């Protein structure tokens, strides 16, 4: 039930106690570095629903990124930027996911869940050997995380006609001149 | 409509017989794997949605739960004997339900099932 | 291209590959279907001789 209560807190995150906690934690994050290691998540309920596991090989990294305009807007989200910076920092791990943890008037703060592919507990667990597979190298760089799908418009409906199957692939498919043998 | 580089984005079809023979070899390989079984799973009879094609019927994705229960084939055992199951579809009509039940009964009457190991 | 021409010029043997396919084109085993299968005939003809239905689709 405790995770349900935490979910309700995160829903009413503008309340007094949550505002105080985010204030203190924002001060702490400003005092720490731009990128740093968490053994335990700040929002365990959010980490658990995103897939964080209490196993040897799962880590959280907390990262602060500059917010604002790039009037040309930077099409990559700050979440994707934080995940990419985490990737260049620890290229050895695999980016499982990411979630917003805090924000300020200059920096926005994210916590990324990362998985170690070379640890045999992760190899054995058949729910995570998929990210152990080599196809998932630098998912943050290829835009394969949740922010990547959201920015790529990987949704069903007439609202996503141009991007449901890949923007560039759809463009190429529509602009190829196919010529059959019997024309 | 040649404003763009159709020169760089023209793709031909000289491999048509090659793809045809490759598809034939692929289905032959599936048959070799499932040597006594049919190559394709049984599929239900469904109706085309739009008004322009109402009077015509085609093949669906999978059989309905109610149709399977009426035909007397368990949900968990139907895919193992080769019956496509679609949980999303609903019957909404006794006519379609009865048609699919008759199809499943014919499949049962024409099917021979081997006793495990 | 330069790679192919280097294989031309080098006195190294050409590594010919055998025609290996992932899936066997014919059934094998001590079962009725494998014993009575005809290699030269196609799938449809073999199923006609066996007496079974090949494709349940239209």
């Amino acid at each position: 039930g405790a995770l349900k209560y935490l979910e309700e807190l995160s829903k009413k995150k503008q309340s007094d106690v949550v505002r105080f906690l985010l204030r203190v934690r924002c001060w702490e994050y400003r005092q720490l570095n731009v990128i740093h290691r968490a053994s335990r998540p700040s929002r365990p309920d959010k980490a658990r629903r995103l897939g964080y596991k209490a196993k040897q090989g799962y880590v959280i990294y907390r990262v602060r990124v500059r917010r604002g305009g790039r009037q040309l807007k930077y099409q990559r989200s700050l979440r994707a930027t934080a995940e990419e910076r985490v990737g260049r920092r620890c290229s050895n791990l695999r980016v499982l996911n990411s979630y917003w943890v805090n924000q300020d008037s200059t920096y926005k703060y994210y916590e990324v869940i990362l998985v170690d592919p070379n640890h045999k507990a992760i190899r054995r667990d058949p729910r995570i050997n998929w990210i152990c597979n080599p196809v998932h190298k630098h998912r943050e760089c290829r835009g394969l995380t949740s922010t990547g799908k959201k920015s790529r418009g990987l949704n069903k409906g007439h609202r996503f006609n141009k991007t449901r199957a890949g923007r560039r692939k759809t463009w190429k498919r529509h602009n190829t001149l196919s010529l059959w043998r019997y024309r | 409509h040649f404003r763009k580089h159709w020169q760089r984005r023209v793709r031909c079809h000289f491999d048509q017989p090659g793809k045809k023979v490759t598809r034939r070899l692929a289905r032959r390989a599936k048959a070799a794997a499932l040597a006594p079984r049919p190559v394709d799973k049984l599929r239900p009879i469904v109706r085309c949605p739009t008004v322009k094609y109402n009077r015509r019927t085609r093949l669906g994705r999978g059989f309905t739960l109610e149709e399977l229960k009426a035909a007397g084939i368990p949900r968990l055992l139907a895919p193992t004997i080769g019956i496509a199951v679609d949980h999303r579809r609903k019957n909404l009509s006794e006519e379609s339900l009865a048609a699919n039940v008759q199809r499943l009964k014919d499949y049962k009457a024409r099917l021979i099932l081997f006793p495990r190991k | 291209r330069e790679l192919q021409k280097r294989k031309r010029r080098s006195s190294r043997p050409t590594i010919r590959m055998p025609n290996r396919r992932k899936k066997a084109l014919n059934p094998a085993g001590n079962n009725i279907i494998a014993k009575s299968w005809n290699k030269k005939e196609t799938l449809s003809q073999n199923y006609t001789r066996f007496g079974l239905v090949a494709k349940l689709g239209k």
């Binding site: 058949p126 | 079984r37 193992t80 004997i81 099917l111 021979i112 495990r116 | 007496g51 079974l52």
Partner: peptide, 21 residues
């Protein structure tokens, strides 16, 4: 493989059959 899938493949395996003409 997972325990659930192992039990499922143990109790409901792929059956070997034929459809008569």
């Amino acid at each position: 493989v997972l325990e659930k899938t192992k039990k499922r493949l143990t109790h409901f395996p792929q059956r070997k059959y034929a459809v008569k003409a």
